[PDB]
Design a protein around this ligand. Structure first.
Ligand code: HZQ
Ligand code: MN
Ligand code: MN
Length: 365
């Protein structure tokens, strides 16, 4: 059985190596009204699904580690704790349950804990003294992987009930997107359903009223092996590309709500970095720059990492070497994305598998 606090890896909790399936759903029907129910019992669809079973089973192990980590996080996350303490307590648990093993099993990306106006990509770097406050709105976004099969899943943490309707708007739009998603469904269609649900909500925060806005330049995306964003974007506003979702694909269905401008800009010190997937081998002679890239290739490959994870490996005075990799185009920085000062942003995100037989919300129990 799992301990309190959790320390037993998911692998050890299922000796047979069969992890629990997430929520399974029938696909949404067409414009004329034809059901997708036929997929659930088709010989040809069941065959293709069973062929990728070892893969679905990898996302399930990673998803079960994510569920047990976020239930544990919800039990102790309180104002007064620093952002370093939150991330380290979360990551230590994540490492134990995923049974971290180099590139074969581990953390798929750094622990986002973005606050207030900052919607995404904020994790503390060393020496960051930020402390979580009672009126803060914190987005916990973390990832787990087994053999590069990534679970991208996020939720918003608040202590003041004044943000309840803001969270409810975004949660409902994320559920809408998950519901609309499916094989042959246009990506712009999923984006318009999300916007329609989010804008139906009106919030009052400290005597001020707002209609919840989707963050138009933030969006859902496709997931590939060892690739967080595989190229297909799921918009959260009207206007997006009429490109369609295909069979066997994996999507992260995230939506963002804001009381601000509904658009985000790079701000603050960067913590998130990721090697560019399309960049091949680049011989480097600069010794410190060479060393840092070998550290990246060994420990992260093409998965995102943060500076705290470099400090953790015993690395120091690597900022110039890291800047060199960024300017060379080998590494891309992913700085914090903020809306305007004084605005509030919320996020909810699940991972969905577009299986031949059904739609599996693998990150939801
Ligand atoms: O949900 C996420 C968290 C962190 C990062 Cl760096 C991401 C990059 C691309 C897409 N989604 C992401
Ligand atoms: Mn995420
Ligand atoms: Mn994501």
């Amino acid at each position: 059985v799992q301990t309190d606090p959790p320390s037993v890896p998911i692998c050890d909790l299922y000796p047979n190596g069969v992890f629990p399936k997430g929520q399974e759903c029938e696909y949404p029907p067409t414009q004329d009204g034809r059901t997708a129910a036929w997929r659930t019992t088709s010989e040809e669809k069941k065959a293709l699904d069973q062929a990728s079973e070892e893969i679905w089973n990898d996302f399930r192990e990673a998803a079960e580690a994510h569920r047990q980590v976020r239930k544990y996080v919800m039990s102790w996350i309180k104002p007064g704790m620093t952002m370093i303490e939150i991330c380290e307590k979360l990551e230590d648990c994540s490492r134990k349950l995923i049974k971290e093993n180099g590139l074969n099993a581990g953390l798929a990306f750094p622990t986002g804990c973005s606050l207030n106006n900052c919607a995404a990509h904020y994790t503390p770097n060393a020496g960051d003294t930020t402390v979580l406050q009672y009126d803060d709105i914190c987005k916990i976004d973390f990832g787990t992987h087994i053999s590069g099969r990534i679970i991208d899943c996020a939720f918003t943490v608040t202590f003041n009930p004044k943000y309840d309707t803001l969270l409810k708007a975004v949660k409902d739009a994320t559920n809408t997107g998950i519901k609309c998603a499916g094989i042959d469904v246009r990506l712009c269609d999923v984006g318009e359903a999300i916007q329609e649900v989010m804008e139906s909500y009106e919030v009052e925060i400290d005597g001020k009223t707002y209609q919840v806005k989707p963050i138009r330049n933030l969006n859902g995306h496709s997931i590939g092996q060892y690739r967080i964003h595989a190229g297909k974007t799921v918009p959260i506003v009207k206007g997006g590309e009429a490109t369609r979702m295909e069979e066997g694909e994996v999507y992260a269905i995230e939506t963002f709500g804001s009381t601000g401008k509904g658009v985000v800009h790079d701000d603050m010190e960067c913590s998130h970095y990721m090697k560019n997937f399309d960049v091949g081998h680049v011989p480097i002679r600069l010794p410190r720059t060479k060393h840092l890239l070998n550290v990246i290739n060994e420990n992260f490959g093409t998965l995102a990492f943060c500076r705290r994870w470099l400090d953790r490996l015993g690395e120091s005075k690597y900022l110039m070497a890291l800047k060199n990799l960024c300017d060379l185009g080998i590494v891309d920085p992913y700085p914090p994305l903020c809306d305007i000062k004084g605005s509030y942003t919320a996020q909810f995100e699940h991972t969905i598998l577009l299986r031949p037989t059904c739609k599996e919300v693998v990150s939801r129990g």
